[PDB]
Design a protein around this ligand. Structure first.
Ligand SMILES: *[C@@H]1O[C@H](CO)[C@@H](O[C@@H]2O[C@H](CO)[C@@H](O[C@@H]3O[C@H](CO[C@H]4O[C@H](CO)[C@@H](O)[C@H](O)[C@@H]4O)[C@@H](O)[C@H](O[C@H]4O[C@H](CO)[C@@H](O)[C@H](O)[C@@H]4O)[C@@H]3O)[C@H](O)[C@H]2NC(C)=O)[C@H](O)[C@H]1NC(C)=O
Ligand SMILES: *[C@@H]1O[C@H](CO)[C@@H](O[C@@H]2O[C@H](CO)[C@@H](O[C@@H]3O[C@H](CO[C@H]4O[C@H](CO)[C@@H](O)[C@H](O)[C@@H]4O)[C@@H](O)[C@H](O)[C@@H]3O)[C@H](O)[C@H]2NC(C)=O)[C@H](O)[C@H]1NC(C)=O
Ligand SMILES: *[C@@H]1O[C@H](CO)[C@@H](O[C@@H]2O[C@H](CO)[C@@H](O[C@H]3O[C@H](CO[C@H]4O[C@H](CO)[C@@H](O)[C@H](O)[C@@H]4O)[C@@H](O)[C@H](O)[C@@H]3O)[C@H](O)[C@H]2NC(C)=O)[C@H](O)[C@H]1NC(C)=O
Ligand SMILES: *[C@@H]1O[C@H](CO)[C@@H](O[C@@H]2O[C@H](CO)[C@@H](O[C@@H]3O[C@H](CO)[C@@H](O)[C@H](O)[C@@H]3O)[C@H](O)[C@H]2NC(C)=O)[C@H](O)[C@H]1NC(C)=O
Ligand SMILES: *[C@@H]1O[C@H](CO)[C@@H](O[C@@H]2O[C@H](CO)[C@@H](O)[C@H](O)[C@H]2NC(C)=O)[C@H](O)[C@H]1NC(C)=O
Ligand SMILES: *[C@@H]1O[C@H](CO)[C@@H](O[C@@H]2O[C@H](CO)[C@@H](O)[C@H](O)[C@H]2NC(C)=O)[C@H](O)[C@H]1NC(C)=O
Ligand SMILES: COc1ccc2c(-c3ccc(O)c(C)c3)ccnc2c1
Ligand SMILES: COc1ccc2c(-c3ccc(O)c(C)c3)ccnc2c1
Ligand SMILES: *[C@@H]1O[C@H](CO)[C@@H](O)[C@H](O)[C@H]1NC(C)=O
Ligand SMILES: *[C@@H]1O[C@H](CO)[C@@H](O)[C@H](O)[C@H]1NC(C)=O
Ligand SMILES: *[C@@H]1O[C@H](CO)[C@@H](O)[C@H](O)[C@H]1NC(C)=O
Lengths: 743, 734
């Protein structure tokens, strides 16, 4: 049993997860087999040639974010002992210089978020084996440095370097003497205003070049931002990319470009992805000579080149967009325009592989929706943050929202269409005419108050995943949504009435109708009474998320109407009853919970009593989640009630005693979470167990606890995570120390 | 010191607050003098002869929300000065037998009283206001409220009679002539006879709302008459009702309004026609010519389902409304407002309020609001303007000012909240009248303010920009409003790690109140001080003063040093563990009210209160404070109100109060005091783990010696130990 780090196999090696544990120094108590050690986000202040002895097999060390709440003191040659160190991460360490005498065995070095202003031969030219060198975020908006200083030809000794990142350093100019081994050169936000012909010669293996943020488009810029003055674009010489014939990724976002020289791509027959966000290219989009130079371009971002002060009727799309044969995703966020017509997108209708059109946040009023029928491969039509009316961390892409436009689980069903955050206040009768066949649909957050009658979705009868979150919908008619017989997922999360006055009823009879409905989410609907039918019914449903409702009211109904609300959901395996303000559950009510359950969540309620006997009603149950409640005790023999339960989550409760033979014998239990409770100790009197969580208990650390210590040691198979936070409250002297420290 | 009731005199009388104390019976522990006894919201089950034994000097008794409640026939008879009895939410099956003739007001709301019998109330001759709403409404038991013939006819001083939320089917016969306010909402009365309201010549208010309701999109249950069928009101229904000031026909499913209804009704002042089907009537509108004295017309939510018309059709007969003060056309739902459409309201001399909330209007011809003599309130919330290039509440017409009063006070108010003004248009404000109060809240507004956006309405005194994404980095931002006094930027953040420039504040000659709550301010660029000679109030809640004051170079040690007129400052929710000792001394010495609550303070340097000779109120609630100083007098003589609840203070320094004569109100509720040892007016102790051992029944006597000092919530100052005692109130032990 390791301490303080959590140690485990990874692939074919053993790894030491030692992060966020308040260590003031590299431990010497690390396993012998460990080759990767993560000490990041700690209180480590100094590193000497002695810190990592007896650990010479180490391949990778991560020291990021040390220390927390002056920087890190790295003695010279501190690491020269480690003859196998490949990857060394020193990020956010407040380093004042490149540490000297770093092992020549290194292949990946990261020194981002430090105060390093000199890049010297001393520091890193002995490191002939570097593949990946990351020096970013060192001089930006800081009294010093004035300017990062790059000793002429530091690199070039680096004949194996493939990745170099100098982004976010005041460089003013591209370093000369860069190795020809480079494939990826990151120079975002480096105050490089001009790109000579000479600057990138000899880099005939370049696959990626990042020059974003040079001559920022500073307008409404979240971070500080010093534009070039004259509002001038970066200045790239004509033939400046002529011997870059491998370039696959070019990121010119936020370089104040008005004009794009088609010369730049003359020798770039493979350009795959072009970032042009945060520029002034409305003009160039209208004409665009350069579009003829990019028959292999797969991803084009022209987002956020709107013209301040302006809100034009139509978008202007060059004919040349049709020369983009290989285009897969066109990102046209925040161009800002009112009407979009069939004819405006004629160019894109020919592109065979175009599957994503992103028209996010253009505040568009009218769209000619039939136009999307005319595309062989549209999979994702993303129209969030428009005005359609009813119809009668420095390791993140800084500029292009890379996470999915639409929830995988929704898009997985087919063509997706996102109309969230528009003006669709009711669903017009022509709302969805001329749409192609949509499988996934977002109407979230449209202040939408439709009285659903069963005819609103007839034009797209095959929607499978429907997101209606954050509207004001009325599904009192039991025909509601019936035209969607293939619907599999429904999200009514956060749905209320338009008045947001307390006292709203709900009819849930529409649910029973669906023969393959699988997931329904009524979270935060504030349901306290159903009208007429007091049972939900489904032969298909598998998941109901009922959180943020008033089951506390429903089950305390003195006349007993909701004793079986859920029983008729006959296939249900997962039920989330969290946040329902539950003090206790009528025994009768709990025994009507569908016997089919596998996972039950009653966490974050106010339960003070739980009838462990009732788990006999539930032969298939595996996960029971009673976290964040007010429970005082546990039944002294669980086995007798269930032989199915795998995981029991009790954390954030008021349990001070473990019953005798509680764990002897739970039998089928693997994960037990008794963390943040009121245990002071554990009897030896209290198995197939494999996680036991205990951090956050006010443990009395005397000789009484010694029982448990030797139970732990004689049960290494049972993981107990997070030891650091298994804290003695008493008796300080002991207080604050980990219960693994005593004798 | 009355227990358990808190007692205090108001005018000649004397009140005994006695609610929310978990009482199971009527204390015989009651001040003999008490004339008003409030017992509501408790755990009471029985009322007897000698539940009020020697209390003949009682005048009002409230027993609402208890615990059903059981009352002995004649339980109240003894009390010959009993005027007002309130018995709501009591689960009563019948009207208590034998009630004092003396009653002028009775209330039996939210009970199960299905029969109104002479036996019950025919003796109560002096009744003026009788409330019986919500007894027979959607519970299978009681199909119908049974009302004895002429039961109310002996009540011949009866002014107000409410029976709303009861199935009656028809207006009861034999009502007394002295009725002035008859409330019959939600009663299932689809027909009004001529005889129903015969001769009620003192009526000023009639409520028929909710009979044959517009059930479509109704929050609570709802059942229309058969078909979309309207209430049926006989042509003569209202013929002898000349006094009527108030008529509520909300949600009666009206398509047609018979102008004859108003023939004999020249003084009608307020008329509710909300939630009906009168798009037609609004276009034609005969009834409109019969309403010369009407002041508040409400036509809200008459929208036709499925429809979204370009225009609104106002009949020209809208000009026959010469007394009009407020028109409420919410939820009509239309797309364009042309100058011509509101011709009929333009010379109505006293029209001060137009409310067009929730119409989803895309375009308005704004110059038209210039053709109005007395507009004060133009309410356009929840439309689509683009950038230009409880029983006793009102079910339907909601009452709560349309615009914060504080804003409206300044002059003409324009609320364009919840529209689509995603930036500020070059011509957004051209051809508006002279606006004093503007609400731009929640338009997803990303304007980079440059100092010229507002110059067509430069006389804005109160500007509300909350819930947008404004960029005010430029030092000229908003300066064009040199008369600006209130600025609200609550919840403003970038549309995507964002820094702030605040220089713009200094330029204002007359700015009173600045609100920056929830701006996640962690850094200022260039200038590190806020500066103003006018600012009285700053709200800096929900920002990163923890980061700013833990700067290495100490840039922000004088962030507010230069708000030299500052009286009120709010540093709540800033994640403060620790305020650097001299940063605290650089807060305006002008300060009167300093709020540092809902942070994480471990320590507080009580000495530094010397530098603040004006401080009346200090608020440190919701922190982790361990200690109070013993010598608070040395450090201030100004402080009146100190608030410490929700801290970890287990010790009260001896003679802490003695002598901080200045202190009037001291809140130590929800702290760790186990006890209290050896000129104040309130002291809050509840929520403390008191030890109820014999030592420190000192404090118990210290309470007796000082009756002047008020302790609220006494039933909740609760022994934790040794217990046994655990759960008992401190007051009870011996
Ligand atoms: C309304 O209610 C629904 C139903 O709950 C919510 O939608 C579900 O949301 C949950 C998360 O809240 C989703 O669960 C997550 O799925 C992710 C996708 O998993 C991939 O890989 C797994 C491997 O097993 C596959 O099963 C799956 O097909 C995918 O290929 C996972 O990333 C998530 O894993 C979580 O657990 C592990 C720990 O075990 C963590 O390491 C992860 O970080 C993570 O937290 C998780 O399982 C679920 O898939 C959604 N379902 C549907 C149908 O949409 C909605 O969110 C809710 N709506 C609103 C508004 O709240
Ligand atoms: C941003 O900060 C603003 C300034 O703090 C917030 O506005 C303030 O809101 C408080 C309450 O949150 C108001 O105080 C209330 O005012 C009413 C009315 O007071 C006036 O009239 C009464 C008689 O009716 C009289 O007694 C007073 O003397 C007043 O003249 C009080 O009745 C309440 O008890 C309470 O004090 C401030 O008045 C108000 N200031 C302004 C300038 O509006 C604002 O809400 C904040 N924004 C957000 C989003 O939170
Ligand atoms: C149909 O429209 C009717 C208007 O014709 C509505 O009648 C109004 O009913 C409301 C809600 O029950 C009632 O509530 C208010 O009155 C109580 C008494 O007023 C006191 O306080 C005020 C304020 O300071 C003062 O001006 C008064 O003199 C008095 O002292 C208040 O306790 C309560 O908080 C509330 O303000 C209205 O007074 C009543 N209007 C009249 C003129 O009687 C009716 O509600 C509506 N029906 C439905 C179902 O919506
Ligand atoms: C400008 O655009 C380029 C692409 O043209 C962006 O390059 C990408 O940068 C992101 C963020 O670092 C990289 O993602 C990372 O990948 C690695 C390795 O698989 C992983 O460790 C990280 O978790 C993350 O997934 C991405 O690889 C890199 N793209 C390529 C093709 O190398 C660049 O960030 C843009 N510049 C700015 C300032 O936004
Ligand atoms: C439908 O649109 C809404 C709004 O765009 C999406 O909501 C976002 O969801 C993610 C993950 O659930 C959150 O982190 C964001 O904060 C949400 N944004 C907002 C503005 O609320 C929603 O996920 C979309 N639905 C689908 C199925 O993709
Ligand atoms: C501007 O418009 C907003 C939106 O209607 C108003 O916001 C309300 O503020 C009050 C507090 O005064 C809250 O109780 C409500 O919840 C808010 N309503 C909404 C819909 O958010 C705001 O009051 C208006 N500003 C002024 C100055 O009148
Ligand atoms: C003077 O400052 C501005 C600021 C913002 C805009 C915008 C704008 C607004 C909100 C948005 O979400 C997007 C993408 C753009 C459009 C036009 N003109 C402006 C002028
Ligand atoms: C069949 O269901 C509906 C539901 C709602 C409407 C609405 C509507 C929506 C939301 C609102 O706030 C207002 C005031 C009206 C307008 C038209 N036709 C409808 C049809
Ligand atoms: C489109 O995608 C397919 C399969 O991924 C690929 O074979 C084809 O080359 C692509 N089309 C073009 C024009 O590049
Ligand atoms: C119930 O759902 C499970 C998947 O959760 C599935 O294996 C089973 O076939 C379903 N049975 C019915 C009747 O829906
Ligand atoms: C400072 O505040 C006081 C009280 O509101 C006021 O009388 C005075 O005019 C203000 N000072 C300035 C310079 O505006």
């Amino acid at each position: 049993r390791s301490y303080p780090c959590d140690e485990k196999k990874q692939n074919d090696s053993v790894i030491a997860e030692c992060s966020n544990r308040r260590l003031q120094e590299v431990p010497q108590t690390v396993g012998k087999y460990v080759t990767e050690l993560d000490l990041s986000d700690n209180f480590i202040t100094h590193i000497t040639n002695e810190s990592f002895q007896g650990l010479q097999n180490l391949t990778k060390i991560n020291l990021n974010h040390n220390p927390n709440v002056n920087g890190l003191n790295i003695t010279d040659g501190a690491f020269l002992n480690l003859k196998n160190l490949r990857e060394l991460l020193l990020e956010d360490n407040q380093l004042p210089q490149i540490p000297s005498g770093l092992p020549e065995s290194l292949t990946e070095l990261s020194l981002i978020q430090n105060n390093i202003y000199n890049i010297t031969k001393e520091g890193i030219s002995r490191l002939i084996n570097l593949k990946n060198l990351y020096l970013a975020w060192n001089c930006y908006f800081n009294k010093v440095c004035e300017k990062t200083n790059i000793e002429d030809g530091v690199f070039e000794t680096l004949t194996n370097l493939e990745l170099l990142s100098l982004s976010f350093n005041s460089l003013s100019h591209v370093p000369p003497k860069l190795p020809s081994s480079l494939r990826k050169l990151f120079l975002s936000n480096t105050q490089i205003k001009y790109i000579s012909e000479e600057d990138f010669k000899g880099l005939i293996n370049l696959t990626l070049l990042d020059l974003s943020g040079n001559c920022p488009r500073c307008f409404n810029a979240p971070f500080p931002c010093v534009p070039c003055d004259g509002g001038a674009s970066i200045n790239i010489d004509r033939f400046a990319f002529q011997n870059l014939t491998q370039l696959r990724y070019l990121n010119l976002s936020s370089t104040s470009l008005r004009k794009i020289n088609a010369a730049w791509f003359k020798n770039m027959p493979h350009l795959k992805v072009l970032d042009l966000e945060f520029n002034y290219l409305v003009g160039e989009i209208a004409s665009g000579a350069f579009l003829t130079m990019l028959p292999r371009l797969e991803i084009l971002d022209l987002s956020f080149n709107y013209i301040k002060g302006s809100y034009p009727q139509h978008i202007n799309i060059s004919r040349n967009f049709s020369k983009l044969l290989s285009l897969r995703a066109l990102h046209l966020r925040g161009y800002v325009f009112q009407e979009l017509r069939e004819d405006d997108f004629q160019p894109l209708m020919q592109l065979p592989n175009l599957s994503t059109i992103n028209l996010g946040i253009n505040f568009i009023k009218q769209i000619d929706f039939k136009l999307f029928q005319n595309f062989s491969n549209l999979e994702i039509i993303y129209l969030s943050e428009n005005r359609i009316s009813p119809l009668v961390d420095p390791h993140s892409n800084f500029y292009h929202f890379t996470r999915p436009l639409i929830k995988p689980q929704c898009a997985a069903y087919g063509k997706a269409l996102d109309l969230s955050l528009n003006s669709i206040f009711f669903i017009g009768p022509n709302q969805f005419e001329n749409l192609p066949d949509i499988a996934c649909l977002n109407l979230s957050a449209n202040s939408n108050a439709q009285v659903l009658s069963g005819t609103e979705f007839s034009a797209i009868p095959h929607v499978k995943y429907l997101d209606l979150t954050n509207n004001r919908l009325d599904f009192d008619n039991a025909s509601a949504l019936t035209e969607l017989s293939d619907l599999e997922v429904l999200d009514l999360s956060y749905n209320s009435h338009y008045f947001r006055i307390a006292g709203v009823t709900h009819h849930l009879e529409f649910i029973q109708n669906f023969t393959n409905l699988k997931v329904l989410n009524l979270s935060h609907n504030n349901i306290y009474t159903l009208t007429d039918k007091y049972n939900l019914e489904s032969k298909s449903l598998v998941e109901l998320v009922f959180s943020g409702n008033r089951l506390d009211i429903l089950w305390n109904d003195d006349d007993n109407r909701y004793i079986s609300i859920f029983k008729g959901l006959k296939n249900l395996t997962r039920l989330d009853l969290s946040l329902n303000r539950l003090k206790h559950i009528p025994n009768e009510a709990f025994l009507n919970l569908p016997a089919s359950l596998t996972e039950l969540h009653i966490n974050d309620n106010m339960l003070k009593f739980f009838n462990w006997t009732l788990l006999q009603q539930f032969p298939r149950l595996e996960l029971l989640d009673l976290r964040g409640n007010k429970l005082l005790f546990l039944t002294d023999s669980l086995s007798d009630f269930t032989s199915s339960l795998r995981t029991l989550l009790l954390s954030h409760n008021r349990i001070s005693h473990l019953p005798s033979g509680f764990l002897s014998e739970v039998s089928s239990l693997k994960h037990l979470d008794l963390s943040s409770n009121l245990l002071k100790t554990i009897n030896k009197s209290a198995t197939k167990l494999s996680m036991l969580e205990l951090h956050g208990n006010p443990f009395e650390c005397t000789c009484d606890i010694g029982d448990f210590r030797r139970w732990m040691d004689e049960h290494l198979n049972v993981k107990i995570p997070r030891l650091v936070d298994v804290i003695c409250a008493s008796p300080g002297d002991q207080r604050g120390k980990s219960i693994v420290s005593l004798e």
